[PDB]
Amino acid sequence: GSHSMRYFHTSVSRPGRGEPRFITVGYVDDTLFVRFDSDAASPREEPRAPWIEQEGPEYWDRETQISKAKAQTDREDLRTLLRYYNQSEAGSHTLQNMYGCDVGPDGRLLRGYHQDAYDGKDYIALNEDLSSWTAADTAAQITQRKWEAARVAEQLRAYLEGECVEWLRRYLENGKETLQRADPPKTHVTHHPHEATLRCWALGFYPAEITLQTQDTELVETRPAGDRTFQKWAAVVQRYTCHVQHEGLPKPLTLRWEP
Amino acid sequence: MIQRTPKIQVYSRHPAENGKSNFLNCYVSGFHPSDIEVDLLKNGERIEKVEHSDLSFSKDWSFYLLYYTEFTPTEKDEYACRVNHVTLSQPKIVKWDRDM
Amino acid sequence: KQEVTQIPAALSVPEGENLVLNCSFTDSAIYNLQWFRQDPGKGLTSLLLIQSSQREQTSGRLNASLDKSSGRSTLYIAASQPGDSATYLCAVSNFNKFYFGSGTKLNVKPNIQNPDPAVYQLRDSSVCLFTDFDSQTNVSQSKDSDVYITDKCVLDMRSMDFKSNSAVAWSNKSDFACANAFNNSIIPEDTFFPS
Amino acid sequence: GVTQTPKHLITATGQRVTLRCSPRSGDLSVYWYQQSLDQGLQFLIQYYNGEERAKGNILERFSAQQFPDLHSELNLSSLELGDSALYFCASSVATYSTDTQYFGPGTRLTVLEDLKNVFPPEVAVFEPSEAEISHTQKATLVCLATGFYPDHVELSWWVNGKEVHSGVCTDPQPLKEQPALNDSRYCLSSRLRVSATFWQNPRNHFRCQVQFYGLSENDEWTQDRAKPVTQIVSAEAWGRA
Amino acid sequence: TRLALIAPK
Ligand SMILES: *[C@@H]1O[C@H](CO)[C@@H](O)[C@H](O)[C@H]1NC(C)=O
Ligand SMILES: *[C@@H]1O[C@H](CO)[C@@H](O)[C@H](O)[C@H]1NC(C)=O
Ligand SMILES: *[C@@H]1O[C@H](CO)[C@@H](O)[C@H](O)[C@H]1NC(C)=O
Ligand SMILES: *[C@@H]1O[C@H](CO)[C@@H](O)[C@H](O)[C@H]1NC(C)=O
Ligand SMILES: *[C@@H]1O[C@H](CO)[C@@H](O)[C@H](O)[C@H]1NC(C)=O
Ligand SMILES: N[C@@H](CC(=O)O)C(=O)O
Structure with a gap:
């Protein structure tokens, strides 16, 4: 682009x-x-x-x-x-x-x-x-x-x-x-404990433009891994699905926390 | 005078794998002015050789830095990062766990 | 390291002619390039300032180009006028250093549509005067160190809209006459020689 | 705009001179340049709001300064013949790489080994030709300046007590009288062409003025002949017939 | 490459 x-x-x-x-x-x-x-x-x-x-x-x-x-x-x-x-x-x-x-x-x-x-x-x-x-x-x-x-x-x-x-x-x-190659993220989800949290991860991607309940969701700032790649995770407090959209991805990937 | 509080994040370059070489990061951002003190700790003890990126700012003119040091993770060793700024009434220490 | 060179060093042209003055420089890390005109009394006057990243500038009949990659600048003067007669210098600004080039001395000769070449002798206060000749007529210097021949020089009577070249010759020699004063210079055959 | 002082300057070797410059009002930056024949226009030094900012290949014996009132001085000491040149002052608003400089009239310095060869000029006007008035219907008057050294001369015409510029030509450079001798005196010619009826009018005064810039009255002189100081030799001409 | 500009405020 x-x-x-x-x-x-x-x-x-x-x-x-x-x-x-x-x-x-x-x-x-x-x-x-x-x-x-x-x-x-x-x-x-x-x-x-x-x-x-x-x-x-x-x-x-x-x-x-x-x-x-x-x-x-x-x-x-x-x-x-x-x-x-x-x-x-x-x-x-x-x-x-x-x-x-x-x-x-x-x-x-x-x-x-x-x-x-x-x-x-x-x-x-x-x-x-x-x-x-x-x-x-x-x-x-x-x-x-x-x-x-x-x-x-x-x-x-x-x-x-x-x-x-x-x-x-x-x-x-x-x-x-x-500079003209796009590295897609390596997404995974973890669980942290009647209340708990689900954390949608996105690791090692370029460029920095990445998109991950627009009120209760907690989204950290995009951070560099130190090797030109970037990281980002989002958390909320099966009925939940985190959206992942990136220029290096073939399709907008949807993921749910595999137990 | 504009004064902004830094957003501290502690993490690692590589995923969780004790026994292999890894890079420990302490990425501060959104702060102002530029004068900031960032230290990386190993079991409460200061890490000697700590690298840091070149000062730069984002759209809203707030700065951001990246302090990083190569280390080998351990289930026993507990690492942390201390950041002192003029906006902080007391220094803020942010400990690093694998899943954050 | 910066070396600014200009070509040509001099230029004598008929009025109305499009002129090409060239400038070259060896260090391309410039802040700007300027074209100045210098008149003997008034000093230097900036004509065009081309910014570092610019490729051309324009002001009336003046148009200059800039190519930092090749280290060249060309000033174009459309339809030259006698009032453009001056010395044209290109200047470059480098890091904490300003450099000027040798300069092009430009003389724009007017058009004498009614040439009436003649040689007169003025009343000695011995001066001979060759005047009213065309701009192509070149006044060669003397053949003897005792006769002094000044180069042609245009005077403008703007009140009547008329110009005329003239050259003055004088000598202390006893055997000195105006009939042979300018004979070392090629003179029109229709030059009026009064008695 | 920019003004410099003095306009002309005749001095001897080993002496020291001070060149003054008042930049354009509001300009904070001043520049000094040396224009010589063998080097062209060479950048000496630049001052910006009192602080020296930039320097070319300025000599160890050249000294300059910008004052709080923004006017600048250039001291040239232990002078040599090679210091003979035109010294220009320029000024600019500040240090903008996108803006230009504004030059002053310049100071003319000639350094001689001794002032013994300094001579004022002799001026003579030559009335027009009778055969020219009958032919061209015009009258041209030639002014001649002879035997001056150095070439610091400014010729001007004055018709009927007031100065003129139309119908005037003047040689751009003085003429060496004896190119054999290296220290030869100079000559310069200028013409004034008026209407034939204007010169024929017997109540018109024609006067060519030669401002010769020579020695100052403060210099020494050990010769019996007149001291060649800055003077104004001129020749008068009135209407004839 | 960088911009060549001197422009004091
Ligand atoms: C000046 O340079 C141009 C190329 O930019 C060239 O075409 C032209 O002939 C040159 N003029 C002279 C007088 O060398
Ligand atoms: C100046 O000259 C260049 C080269 O011939 C030309 O491309 C450009 O259009 C000219 N600019 C103007 C304003 O005439
Ligand atoms: C004109 O004459 C002068 C001698 O006074 C000579 O130097 C010059 O080359 C001549 N120019 C032309 C175009 O003949
Ligand atoms: C010019 O006239 C003089 C006479 O004063 C003569 O000696 C000389 O040979 C002439 N030169 C030419 C080129 O005719
Ligand atoms: C120049 O010399 C004069 C002496 O006439 C002195 O007052 C002045 O301070 C000198 N300036 C510099 C810059 O050397
Ligand atoms: N010589 C003059 C006489 C005059 O103007 O007094 C003429 O012919 O006009």
């Missing part, structure tokens, strides 16, 4: 303890493939998937230079936003950014996204027209007028419509064995 490439950034200021901690990661669909952490001795963008290691040094140097420039831009933004919100320089604050592009099975661009948060709340975001901003408060409106003046969206829109799609198309080709 459809695919995606995303880049996540996080800068957390550390007052009196030095320069802010910067961590950025890159995802194709739900697969991590690149990272950069400022808390390393020699900070460089490092690979996290086999299909990305084939890139030459001109790729990794550019990725490292862009990560370091974003860490520098964030350090200035932290101090700038203290002025905007009139906050003390003694407190830790967090700037998050996410940007990326959604492509369909045909390879064209479905949606481009670029959004920033400050202390966990939305700050400014590129609208889906890739041409206008929505700022969350009057301080973000300061950023918005500066970003409109400097024609920031023009570059974002060119990247999301152009470079983002082209490289996502390349990544899926070089990693078609791991």
